[PDB]
Every structure is written in C-alpha cells, then in structure tokens.
Amino acid sequence: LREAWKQWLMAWTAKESSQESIEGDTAILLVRAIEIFGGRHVLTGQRPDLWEYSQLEQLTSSICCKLSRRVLAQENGESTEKVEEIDQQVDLEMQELTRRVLQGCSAINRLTRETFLHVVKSFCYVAYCSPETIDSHIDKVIFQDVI
Amino acid sequence: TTTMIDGIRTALRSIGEGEISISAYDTSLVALLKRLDGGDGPQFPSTIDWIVQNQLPDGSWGDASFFMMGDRIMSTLACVVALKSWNIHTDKCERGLLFIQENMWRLAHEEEDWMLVGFEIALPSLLDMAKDLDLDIPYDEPALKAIYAERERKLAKIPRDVLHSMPTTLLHSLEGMVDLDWEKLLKLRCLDGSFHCSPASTATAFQQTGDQKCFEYLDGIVKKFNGGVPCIYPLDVYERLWAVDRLTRLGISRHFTSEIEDCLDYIFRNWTPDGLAHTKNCPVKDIADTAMGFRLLRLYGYQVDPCVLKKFEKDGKFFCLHGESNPSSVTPMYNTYRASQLKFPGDDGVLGRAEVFCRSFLQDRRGSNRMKDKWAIAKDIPGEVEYAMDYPWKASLPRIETRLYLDQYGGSGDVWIGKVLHRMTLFCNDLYLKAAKADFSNFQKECRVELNGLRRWYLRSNLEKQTTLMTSYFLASANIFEANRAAERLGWARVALLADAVSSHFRRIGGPKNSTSNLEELISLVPFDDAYSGSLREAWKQWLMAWTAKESSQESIEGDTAILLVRAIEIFGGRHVLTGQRPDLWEYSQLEQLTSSICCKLSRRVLAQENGESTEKVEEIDQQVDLEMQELTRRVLQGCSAINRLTRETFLHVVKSFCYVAYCSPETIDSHIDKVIFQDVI
Amino acid sequence: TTTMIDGIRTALRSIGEGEISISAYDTSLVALLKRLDGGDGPQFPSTIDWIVQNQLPDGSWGDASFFMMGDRIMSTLACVVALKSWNIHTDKCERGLLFIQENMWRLAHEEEDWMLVGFEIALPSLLDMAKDLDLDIPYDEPALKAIYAERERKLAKIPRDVLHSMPTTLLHSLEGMVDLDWEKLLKLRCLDGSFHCSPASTATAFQQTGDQKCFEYLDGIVKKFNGGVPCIYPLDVYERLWAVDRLTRLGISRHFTSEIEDCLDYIFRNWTPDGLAHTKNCPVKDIADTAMGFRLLRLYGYQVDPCVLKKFEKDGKFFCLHGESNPSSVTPMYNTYRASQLKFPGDDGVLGRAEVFCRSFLQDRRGSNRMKDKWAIAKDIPGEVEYAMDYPWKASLPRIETRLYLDQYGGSGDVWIGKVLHRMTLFCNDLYLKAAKADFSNFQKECRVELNGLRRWYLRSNLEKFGGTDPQTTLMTSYFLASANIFEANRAAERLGWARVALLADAVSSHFRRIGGPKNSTSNLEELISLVPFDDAYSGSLREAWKQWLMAWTAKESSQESIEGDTAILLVRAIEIFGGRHVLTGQRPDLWEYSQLEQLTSSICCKLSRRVLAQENGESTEKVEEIDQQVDLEMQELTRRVLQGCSAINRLTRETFLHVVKSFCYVAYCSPETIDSHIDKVIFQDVI
Ligand SMILES: CC(C)=CCC/C(C)=C/CC/C(C)=C/CC/C(C)=C/COP(=O)(O)OP(=O)(O)O
Ligand SMILES: CC(C)=CCC/C(C)=C/CC/C(C)=C/CC/C(C)=C/COP(=O)(O)OP(=O)(O)O
Fold it and tell me: What does UniProt say about this protein's domains (chain A)?
C-alpha cells in the first residue's frame, strides 16, 4: 500500500499542467489496493499473464478517463450530440472490457478479472445516477429492514 | 584496429591531473624569483634551461602551429624581460626585440572576440616592468590606448572592495594590481593554497610576502613536470567531464563501460550545492561546467537536482562568471541548452527559463556571421549548434548524430583560450578518430550486407498484398547498432514490414470483417527457433484481436503496432521480468500505457497536420506529447529500479523511432540514409 | 570440493572400535607365548610373519618419519629378543645389534618431557632379559644411571600396598615388576579382561597364570588386525571426542550435523559420575577427557553437571592422573581452561578455582620457554595457547578462530606419546585440511563480491555527507563484524541486511551527535529507511522498528543515559525480520524467554558503552575491573539462557542474540590497528 499510494501521488504531480483528467489513476489505485488486500499475486514469469494484465489496466484507465470527460461535459452548457459520441465510445470500450473479462480460456485468475469488472461497474454506476436515486437505494438496501 | 582501443583505454584508466602544454609567459614569470640563502642567481634552473632550450626559428615563443598575434608578443616580451634581466644569452635577447618591433603593426588587424585572459590588465604591467631595462618599445599606438580603455571599463565594472570580501575571477591575473593589502586578502585564497590556480599570481604574491604554502605549491608544480610551468593547474574535473562527453559522442562508449563509471564517480563525489568549476578547491563555480556534469550525471542514471543552476539567475540573464566584462561565448550557452532537454516533470521551472533564454540568445547570434566563441577554437561550432537546434532530444537517433559529427572533431588542432594558448592531450587526439572510423566502417559494411540479405528474403516471401524495406532497416539499425544484436535487428524489421503489409491489406479490402482468409498462420513466414515458437504467435494473435476490436472507432491502431513491435524486440534475445514483485508489474504496465498513448497521439498529429488546419492544433498536440515524453524519459533512465536495462531502453528506442518518423521530411530522411548506410568514409 | 566431503562423511558414519597404527614392541612381547597344545612354534605365528617383513632399511624399527632415540632403542631390542628367542631368521639380529651398539651412546641428548610412558619400568627389565642371553650391548653409560634413579623416584610414589587395592596408572607397565600377589590382583582388571587396555601386560599375565579371558582378548585383537598388535586398544571414546573437536574448531562441522549428534550420543550414554575415561570400560579416570567431553556436551545443548571435576582436586592444585612424576601437562590444563569458559551462574564454584589455577600455570609456563608437552608433539602449540588465552569466550568470533587455526593443523605430522610413538589416523589426516581450505576460499570469493556490491550501494545513496572522516574504514569494519558470524552460503539476505542497517544507524547517530540533540533537528529522518531495496515480506514491517528506534532516541534526551542498547535491539530485530522467523506467542514461556533475552542484551550493551566511556577519560583500574565483573555476570546469564534447552524457540533466534552480543562485546576489546590486521588477514589474505 505504501508503494501504491506513492505511485498515485507521483501520477498526481506528473499531470499538473495538462488538460487530461486524473480519474484513471484513482481507478488503478483502487484496483491495486483491492488486489493487495485480497492476497493474490500474478505469475509474472510467463508472457501471456503480463500482457493480459497490461491490457486490462490500460482498458480500465481509458474507460474511467472517458467517463470523467462525459461527466464534466454533461452539466456544462453543451449540446446533446457530443454526449452521445462519448457514450458510444464508452460503450465500445466497455464491451471490449467485458469480452476480455467474461472469457473462459484466459490464463489469469478468476477473481482478478471480477475485481476489474467490479471497479469499472462501480464508476460507471456512480456516473449515471442523480444523488436522489442514490440516497433512495442506500436507504432501501442496507437500512430498509427485510424481515 | 582493436589495439588502438586497448591503448586509449590504458592511457585513460591511468588518468591524473590532465596533460596540458607549457607556456612561455608563466615560465618566464616564475624564473625571475630569486633565492633566499645567498642567492647567486634565480631559484629554479630548470625553467631558465627550458627557456634557452626551446627557441623558435623566428626567435619568438609560443606554439607556431597556429600563428596568433597577442600571445606571441606577450610571451616574447615577458621572456625577454627575464633573459635580459639575468643578463645571460644576450645574443638572442634582442633577436626577439627585432621581431616585436617589426610586427607590432598587426595589433590593428587582430580579432576582438579572441582576447586572452587578463590581456588588458597584464600587458600594461608588462610594459611597466619592461620600461626599466635597456630595450626598445613602441609606446605610442592606438592598439594600446584601446586596451587601456578596456582596462578602465573592467575596473569600472569591478571595484576594489570585491577583492577583499569574496573570491573573484580577478585573482587569475594579479600582475597588474597594486596595493593589494594582503592583510585580509591572504585568507581569501583557495584551499590548496594557490591563487585561483595561477602560478604567476602565486609567485607575485610570494615575492611580496614570505608565505610557505604558496612556496610549497610552486615547488611541487615545478618538480612535477621536470622543467616548465603550465598556464593553469590542476584540471582534474574539467578534463574528466569533457573527455567523457567527447568519448560518448563519437560512438565508442560501449567499450569503456567501466572507466566511464569510475570517472563519473569522482564527479558525483564532489557535487557541491554550488557547482564544480575545474577542481574541488576553486570556489568560482561558473555555468559551463555544471551544464555538463548535471547532464552527464542525469544521463547515466544518477540522482541530481537542477535547483543548483538557479544560482546563476540574474534578471532573466545568465552569467558565465561573476564579473564577465563581455557578452558570453556560445559553448557555455550551447551546453546549457543541450542540458535543458533531459527535464523531469517534478523539476523546478529554472530549466523552463533557460530553454527559452538560451534559445533566443543562440538564435540572435546565429542570424549573422557572429558565431565566434570566446573560450574555444574549433572547426565548425555553428554547424553543431545548427544540428542541436534543428533536431531535439525527442527525435535524435544516436547513429545520425554520430555520423553527422564524426567529420567535425578537431583532431589535434583544437587550441583553447586561457592566459596563454595551450593544447589538450587527453581528449584532443587522433587515435579517437581512427578507432571511430574503424568501428563505423565495420558497422557500415555489416549493414550494407544485411540489407541485401533482408531484401532477398522479402522478395522470396511474396508480400505484395517497395521502398519501405530500406527505411525500415535504417530505422532498425539507427538504434541497435551493436556487433552481436542482428538477431534483434532483423526481428525489429521483419515484424514492422509484415505489419504495414497487413495494415494496407485491411484498408484495401474494406474492413477486417469482410476478410475470407485466415491470417494467424502468417507468423510462420518469419524465421523461428524452438525456444520461442508460439509466444511470438501469441503476440501476433493478440495484435490481430486488438485490431478487430479497435475497428469502427476513431483511435488509430498504430499504438498497438508499437506495442507489438516492442514485444517482438523482447522475444528475440530472451530476457524476462523474472524477479517478481508488485512494482515490476506496475512499472511494466505504466511503460506500455505511456508508449501506446504517445504513439496514438503522434498518429493523430500527423493525420491532422496534412489536412491543412490552423497551426495552433499542432502546437497543442506538441505540448501534449512533450508532457508525456517528459514522464516517459524519466521512467526510462532513472536507474533506481529492478528491470533489466535493455528491456527499459527498448521502449525509448521504439518511441524515438516513431517520433523521428513523424518529425521529418522524406527528402531529408533519404539524405540521411544515403549519407549513413551508402556513402563510405575515409 | 564435494567428493571429499562425501569421503569424510563415509569415514565418519562407519566409526567403530577405533583405528590406530601397529607397533613392533608389543608384537615382540606377544610372540614370546609358547604354544598351548604342546607344540614347538609360538602360539600366534602371524606376529613373526609380520615382524620379519617390516624391518626398516637402516636396520632398525619404530616410526619412520619422526626420529626419537628411546622409540628405536625399545623397538629394536624387543625385535632382536623376539628373533633370538625362537632362533629363526638370525641374519638380521646382527644388523640390529650393530645399530644398537653404534647409537646407544647418543641417548644423553633426549628431552626430559619426552619420556615414553612406562619407560623407566620397561627399559631396565628388557635390559635384564637381554642379559640372560649372550648379547654384547654397552650396558655401561652415564645416561642409564638416570633411568635407574627415576625408577626409584617413581616407585617411591606408589608403594606395594596401593598397587594391590586401588587400580592406578601403573598397570599399564606390568612386565617390569615381580613379586606380584596374583590372588589380590585378578580383581582389578578391566571389564573386557585385559589389564588397563594393554596387550603387553595381558601377555605377561597370561604366561604367568592360567586365566582364560585374557587369552580370548589376545586372540581377538590378533585376529582383528591380520597379524600385528597395537600400542593400546580400544579407543571408542577418545576418537569420537577428538574427531568432533577437530571438526568443530575447523569450521566444517555444519555439513555433518546428522552424524555429530549421533556421535555424541555414545558419550552422553556413558557419562560415569566420577568422570569419563579413554574408553567405555576402563576403571581409572583422568582430566583430558572429562573437561573436553563436558564442554562439547554442553556446547551442543545437553544437560551435564560440572561437579564431577571436584574429584581431581588436592589442596587447591589439580592434576591429570592418580600419581605421576613430572607435572608437565600442557594439553590437559589447556583443555580444562578452555572448558572453564562455558559457565552457568548456578553451577558449583569449582570452575572458578579451575580457571584461576589453569591460568596461573599456563601464564607461568608461557613466561619461560617450556611450551613442550608430554603427550603429543604438534606443529604449533604456543599459537593455540596464546589465542585461547588472549581472546576469551566473549570476544572470539568463529570465523577468526577458524582462519587462524587453518595453520596450526598437524595433517600427518602429528604423533602421540604412548608406550611407543604411534600415529593416529581418524582425526590426523589430509582430507580435513584440504576440504577446510577449499571451503574457506569458496567463502572468501562470495565475501569479496558482496563487499563490492555493498560499496557501490553505499556510494550511490549519497550517505557520505554523514559518518566519520574515512568512510571506507567504517564500511569495512561494519561488514567484517557481520560476515564473521553469519558465515553460511544462503544467508546473504541477513548479512547484507545487517550491514545496511548498521551503516544507516551509524550515520544517523553521527548526524545527531554533531548537532546537539533531537530537538535542534529539522530534516525528515524517518524516510531514510526507504534506501534499503524494496520487497514484500522483508520491508514494510521494518519501518516500525525504525520508528521505534527514533522514538527511543527522542525519549532519552533529558536524561544522560546511552543509546547503544536500543541500537543493539534494532539490530537483532532487523536480523529477525529477514529470514522470515516468527515466534508463536500463543503459549507464554516463549514470550517470557524473548523478553528476558532482549532485556539482557540491552543491559549488557549499555554497560559496555559505559565501560568504554569511563575508560577513555583515564580513570583508575578499580572502576574498570568492577564494570568488567558486572558485565561478565550478565554475560554468563545470557550464555546460560542461550545454550540451554528448556523453552521452545527456533534455535536460530537465540543464536542471533548471541551473535549480536558477541559482536558488540568484541568491538570494544581491541585497538583499531588489531581489528584492521584481522580484516586484512581474514578476507584479503588468500588461501592456496
Ligand atoms: C569554461 C571552460 C570551458 C573551461 C574553463 C577554462 C578555465 C579554467 C579558464 C580560466 C577561468 C578564468 C579565470 C576566466 C577569467 C574570466 C574573466 C573575467 C576574464 C577577463 O576577461 P573578460 O572579462 O572575459 O574579457 P576579455 O577576456 O575579452 O578581455
Ligand atoms: C588420556 C589422554 C589425555 C590420552 C590417552 C593416550 C594414552 C594412550 C595415554 C596412556 C594411558 C596411560 C595409562 C598412561 C600411563 C603411563 C605411565 C608411564 C604412567 C605413570 O607414569 P606417568 O607419570 O604417567 O609418566 P612418566 O612415566 O613419563 O612419568
């Protein structure tokens, strides 16, 4: 966790004068922290696992960056077409990610791909809901007693 | 010849305080120091023996291999003022007097931008001390009132109070100074005990007060050379840095990978928070040494911080020294500019100001024929400034640079400018040129053979689904040019060729979904061994999948092509990330992502530039790729990680190849090609 | 290399009744047995068959390599007597008699300490046996009178009474006595059936009595060696002890940790309450085996009591055997002194008097030039004695003693004074020295390589802006003090760790000591621990130790106490981190053992720091001696707690505590020039 936080902070101080958002770095930090807390290494010896992990990380970073850009452009005084463009690109990247994750002939473990999917789905969910529905769901899931 | 390499290595690994020539001025000035006990003549006989031993045919002094004017007349007068003061060998004394009396008319045609150190403060004092003895002087001449005016300007810019509170560059020439008031000035000299490492000034100071440390220094420096005293001593930090520079720029650095480290060690052990001028003693750090040591240390994987360069900042202008009474030269500014490339994102903005101020400076003086420097004399400095200003670090392949420079090294004719004229022996030699030419010819012949060796296979492989073969092989050879890396070079080239072939085929057929044939089997055409049989096939399948997934979108597929080419380089050679950590995974992922992003951005830029849009979008994409390349360059040459060095240099090689492709014109590319791999040398 | 280790392991795993070279005198004295069944030839003809085919080219007998007078005299006289008795092969008797009558004159220059056992009781009787026959030997000699005088001098110490009641060291030479009460003498022999493990005495008693067990012993020892009888037999306890000692003190014992533990079990199973002996079934004991066996049994983690040494006391003056003439015994007193270092505080106080008397005697003998022993010559005894005396148990790193001991080994040049000069083979060999030298060189190579690597790491991290005015000496000292204890091949992750953390501590300490305390500091110091290369298991749990040490620094300011204790605690914790060794604190005794060990280490290091400080300022000797005793008490307690076997902790942890304390205690008992000589001799001085 020390190293992961150091890398995240270095990525902060390395993109201070650019117009690119920094949500991808936070997503990568969350994924690395979950993988560390779980206690699952990755066999870095053979090439296919390395390449699979690199592809997955690049995909989730790009997806989170696109989501951040869409969320920024939404509330601002923009038209209703650029939003559709960004949504189409987001959907293409998401379908590629779910192809890479839900497959069955891969060599990486099962839980790591599901962790990637959980993080990306959490981001995409929190990006697509007004706070009122979030409050309603919070009150209905862990507070509204069932039986 | 390989023996020359071992010879220069043996001469380098036994380095000392630098081997420079001897000056007549200094020998004459130190010869006239008389003894203490009795004193039946001067102190040292070796100096006067060398004086009477090394007369030129014209009767003058100095190195006649380059006929200057000022140094010759100064040395002759300062030598006669002693040869006729001790009243010995009188038959040759006036022989030099005739020379000066017949050639004093040249001081109205000599260059202004080449004036020796302390000239305007050592020539009047020389005339003063020569007044007494029986000898003829042409006192009245405008070329003397001129130097008097320069002396007055120097004394106007440099008051007297500076010579008693802080070290100052004046102490190198203490001859034309009176009423020194050595009470406070004696505790201000250097740590070795000298006076700014100038034997003449130490002799002048010891003549007026009996100090023992200056006596010991003079005795040691005269007994070291066994006859003769150099113009300046020692030179144990300047020589090392400049030798390492002139050695790594020629292209034989890979042979001496041990002595270079054991030579930069002595630089890193003396990185004072102020700087390093020429020794660990002289406390007058200038900006022509730092700009060199900092760049070199940061290039070979060390830990340095450029906040020290801020100490020369004065109102946007940069001082060469503390009291420069002259517009600075080009070599310190040129070195500052060349060291303002390896900037890291977290570094202070001091480099951001140098990168523009020095650019403006070197652009003004380049817009004319005013390219004369002040601290050096070389064959073609404007050409090298042109090269360093036309091609930045982002698109500077090593082979192109070494080829364009190999015909610009001064050999043995590079004189320098101090108090007298002197020549360097370590990094001004002809063995370097011989070894560099031999190695370059070997590489050229190897490439000229392997180019046809590759063209034959290309014609036999039936891949016409042209001219890209020669360019591809030139790009493959301009980076990995070592003797035993053909296995990686051919792999570099073949995968790129097959890739652009399939890329053209997919575009022609109209999509990768209307393809009726199978394509994964195409990898069998490339030669293979048993150890790496399917891994390359796996990478090829991954590239094909990345293509069929990145279709009907906007981002180009060139990034994945760069990543595939990198993995291909990685397969040939067989080195893993076998250590096994979390930082290793993270470093690999970050490097791959940065490479892909930079490649895609350059693809977008080259696509959007041809369209003829406004010139501002180009500036935007350029600033973006610069902000990315800074971080990539930081991660490549940090030298504090656990990844095999070549696996790290591969990414930089590929990214620089792509940047050079995107930042050049085809005709200039072809000129570089047929100048490097077609036109022979010698 | 590695086949030599296999040969040595094979020679060890099949040890038995002992290996020892044959001797001609005993064979001659055995051949004189006339046949039992009534024949004419001797009972054992293999003795003659051997004795006739082993004559030296010179025409003499005895040992070939070495050359001593009494050996040759006795061997040749016995051989000529055994030849003349049966009166066969009489062509060589004159060849031997020539040598005798030509070299008996030179019997006046032999040393006084080198006197064979039973010499003054076997030479006169053999001369009398020769006088019965007509053999012209120079019976007259000024030297022979000294022998007859020494005979009476020894006979005065043992009367005719105690020889028939208590078994003494006299039965080893019996043929040189007559008028024996054989009734009250058959009740004193060994359990095997031989008189004090001696074939000559058994032979003499057989031809003068009608016993049957002695005949069985003689027949067995004759048949086991296919002709020829040895000087003494068996040796089933001597060989084991001295082989284990020569393997331990040579630095090669780690490869044989599965046989040494199976070799010491035989000694532990036969721990006779009044001391050990030179075999399992000898009724007289001595000190050259009790002390050595006790020390060896205690150093490997057994349960032995040292009160058995009380039997060897007589008016505050020890001895080696029950009644002797010349008390010139260097090896027994030396071994007793060396076994007087291991000492628990609750043991009986006899070891104190043992140490005192042995040190007094050895210092007396070292003042003069009488460093000659009566049991065995060697290559260098004074070197061994001076080393074991000048560097006590507290400050004797094993690698140093091994590097020094790779010179004083005898190889094949050793010989032990018994009834005649006889060579031992199982622990006086040539494979031992060669294997030890090879292993030492193989260690030195890795030492040099890792030293270079550590030097590069020290240069790259700009950690020379602190430290003394000569960083190379500090680096060399702090790496030698680490590569001398953990010397194995697969513990680099602990060696280099110790070195790095020691350098960091010694830099931060100087930086703090040149400023004026922790309050006047401004830089971030907690971050210096990141200079150690990153890992997953090792790092991460080390910043805790660093922060605890820094809290210890910032908490001991208003007082005046030292800080070395917390530095030793940091070193032991950081050595425990690497290697990956936990302690199962689930059960309590392990927790309590760990706490006690840590507290003892801290206190000892603080007391040593106080000693060095109060000794530098030039005070009297009383304070220094008091501090020395105060330190030695806790050192004894720590040694007891580390060597014993009660709690259940991984032995390597307690051994790490011992290593750290040994280093911190050794660094304060030597001048810098001496430690520099040691660093130069251990690493750079190459072998073979
Ligand atoms: C800087 C490089 C590449 C090498 C160093 C070579 C050295 C040590 C040169 C001597 C340094 C020194 C004492 C320079 C003197 C600086 C000075 C104020 C000279 C006075 O002359 P200027 O004020 O430059 O004007 P002119 O030299 O044109 O008269
Ligand atoms: C027990 C140790 C340390 C070694 C054993 C090695 C052997 C074979 C020792 C001989 C065993 C033994 C019974 C020796 C006694 C021989 C003897 C002469 C006893 C009486 O005289 P000493 O006083 O021992 O010696 P001197 O005869 O030279 O006076």
Answer: The Asp-Xaa-Asp-Asp (DXDD) motif is important for the catalytic activity, presumably through binding to Mg(2+).
